[PDB]
């Protein structure tokens, strides 16, 4: 069983708090969105204090490493974005990090406790107390940086030198690309210490098993129409039998897309070349594959390495990044029944 | 036949000229890249003057509408990027625009004359003179902007109000998305005056037939591995017969990908939702389809409408853009044998 005496709760900033800091696309829904989150944060904190747990409630600007150190456990109160924020400042594989979905009608909360615990949190505490749960260590990617002209200083997106460790780990993915959305990205890639291979594309995505359902899923999943087309082509071009139906096309589609998801516990990186350009002057290889190690040498003008959509690093011509998975970067999370 | 007496040649700026305005990723190749382009520009201009044609050679900063007006024809001397630059300032469907690939080992030049004419330009002039060619009018998209808080002023990326016409046409595509590469984009889309539909994704691409081979192709094409997987799934899940082989998988792949390309002359927009997010809180519809008309209402924080990778417009919450295809926006281009 597991009973912290000391807990920091990191709560997301709501849209309403943002504007506080009408037209027609806000206010009415926004204030109700704010009341729901606040009602649920209060339920979490009241429930913790009723178990005798000391609690510090902070917003993003006050969530710091000192407070993580003070705490026995971190609770992210918001959505998956709030889990990523919480994980960004936890580097100890023994420190539990737990997510509570505070607006389940608008937050997916895939990294969070099942939705029932949002308004039944004492039930979650008791399940923890009795050990009716399992530890889940989610693998994360660490980033090294070397080369010429490099700038290793992290930028917080929510407002010749040897390899040095960058101060965040990726729980979802590392995205590498030019800052301008229409500017093709140019680099060289070494996978598992293999040969260097020039790529031109709209960026690279390097995700964990946790991240396999996030950005990586939407880069790689095929539409049920595309599957329907591919199958119809296979009839014309060789009468590949079968009866294609509504049911079958969805099925085969779903089987393909599940192949893109893998276990959060497996220490492997799924890397995807995002929208590669082939034609007669460039040539690309595989679109995606698993690996333990990816090294990227920047050839970019004004590009960034973005960790979990939250922390950005400069990555221009001369910079060399290496990504791997290290056991000491595992993020300690919990699994409850729903 | 077709014999201009007055011609403006727009020549790209080379990398060397850029730096002029070594390590290891430049110079050696860069100066040879520069000599090749310059040698070919001189051949073009010498050939024109030898036909008695008056010629003004300009770089991007001096390419203006006045000079287009002066000219009987525009020649873009570079790659497809130089064709797009040239087309950006031509709004008259009667003014010929012709592209010459000045570095065919590094420029694809899909919008340009066949590579042989790069060093055999008098042959192209004579073919023009004798009418051994066909006019190709490439359809282009025009952009209207309305709404609240809008800013219709174009930004040149290479350094309550009613609908107003934006001053460029898209020869390849209009891209719409948030400026930050990791920030999901949010908007509502009306296709052919249909119902408004909320989307969340990494942007929208709205291309012409000319643009169908560019960005749109790499957003939508499927990998030969994915086809191989989809086919193998169809065996397991219903023994859909056939013998899958190296040959067959490439074939079916190629048939699918050709379905993404359409004629530059056809007045239809192929629009693609780029990396839509579905899950349990959002829901998307079709990934791509043809249309005559797409209206997009921005819900974005800090987004842009990017025309042919060269001209950018602000497009944040309150802005409403409508895209269509108008005959007076056709771009007059030529077709030569190779
Ligand atoms: N086109 C795309 O798919 C795209 C574009 C940009 C970013 N992203 C992803 O969004 C992450 C940043 O999340 P954010 O909440 O700060 O911004 P966000 O725009 O709210 O994220 C988009 C959605 O993905 C969900 N999500 C986040 N991490 C996930 C995971 N590991 N597995 C499954 N779903 C997940 C989020 O859930 P909640 O509703 O609980 O927030 C959200 O509904 C990034 O690391 C990136 O992976 C995806
Ligand atoms: N991931 C992607 O596929 C991606 C990302 C950004 C932009 N783009 C495309 O590139 C366009 C801007 O071109 P750029 O030359 O200024 O930058 P660029 O990075 O040099 O364009 C990428 C390549 O596409 C080729 N291309 C351009 N227009 C084409 C067309 N209509 N059909 C077939 N190929 C075409 C270019 O040919 P050249 O070698 O002759 O220049 C170039 O090789 C944009 O409108 C957009 O469509 C694609
Ligand atoms: Ca979120
Ligand atoms: Ca180019």
From Swiss-Prot, chains A, B:
Tissues/organs with expression: Widely expressed.
Subcellular location: Mitochondrion
The protein's enzyme class: transferase
GO MF annotations in UniProt: ATP binding; NAD+ kinase activity; protein homodimerization activity
Inhibition and activation profile: Inhibited by NADH, NADPH and NADP(+).
EC number(s) given by UniProt: 2.7.1.23
One cellular component (GO) term of this entry: mitochondrial matrix
Reactions catalysed, as given in the entry: NAD(+) + ATP = ADP + NADP(+) + H(+)
Source organism superkingdom: Eukaryota
UniProt record similarity statement: Belongs to the NAD kinase family.
Protein name: NAD kinase 2, mitochondrial
Organism from which the protein derives: Homo sapiens (Human)
Lineage: Eukaryota, Metazoa, Chordata, Craniata, Vertebrata
């Amino acid at each position: 069983g597991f009973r912290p005496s000391r807990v920091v709760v990191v709560a997301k900033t709501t849209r309403y708090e943002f504007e506080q800091q009408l037209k027609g696309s806000s206010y009415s829904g926004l204030l109700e969105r704010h009341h729901i989150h606040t009602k649920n944060v209060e339920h979490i904190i009241d429930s913790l204090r009723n178990e005798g747990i000391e609690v510090r409630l902070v917003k993003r600007r006050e969530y710091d490493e000192e407070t993580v150190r003070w705490a026995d456990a971190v609770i992210a109160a918001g959505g998956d974005g709030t889990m990523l924020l919480a994980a960004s400042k936890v580097l100890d594989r023994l420190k539990p990090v737990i997510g509570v979905n505070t607006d389940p009608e608008r937050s997916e909360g895939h990294l969070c406790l099942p939705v029932r615990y949002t308004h039944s949190f004492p039930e979650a505490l008791q399940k923890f107390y009795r050990g009716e749960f399992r530890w889940l260590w989610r693998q994360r990617i660490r980033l090294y940086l070397e080369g010429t002209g490099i700038n290793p200083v992290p930028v917080d997106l929510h407002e010749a030198s040897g390899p040095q460790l960058l101060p965040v780990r990726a729980l979802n993915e590392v995205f590498i690309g030019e800052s301008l959305s229409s500017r093709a990205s140019y680099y060289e890639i070494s996978v598992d210490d293999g040969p260097w291979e020039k790529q031109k594309s709209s960026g690279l995505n390097l995700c964990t098993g946790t991240g396999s359902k996030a950005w990586s899923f939407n880069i790689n999943r095929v539409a049920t129409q595309a599957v329907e087309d591919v199958l119809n082509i296979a009839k014309r071009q060789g009468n590949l039998s079968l009866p294609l139906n509504r049911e079958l096309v969805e099925k085969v589609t779903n089987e393909y897309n599940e192949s893109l998801l893998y276990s959060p516990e497996e220490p492997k990186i799924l890397f995807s070349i995002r929208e590669p350009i082939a034609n007669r002057v460039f040539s690309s290889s595989r679109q995606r594959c698993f690996s333990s190690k990816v090294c990227v040498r920047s050839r970019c003008w004004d590009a960034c390495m973005v960790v979990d959509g939250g922390t950005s690093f400069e990555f221009n011509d001369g910079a060399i990044a290496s990504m791997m998975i290290n056991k000491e970067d595992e993020l300690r999370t919990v699994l409850l029944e729903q």
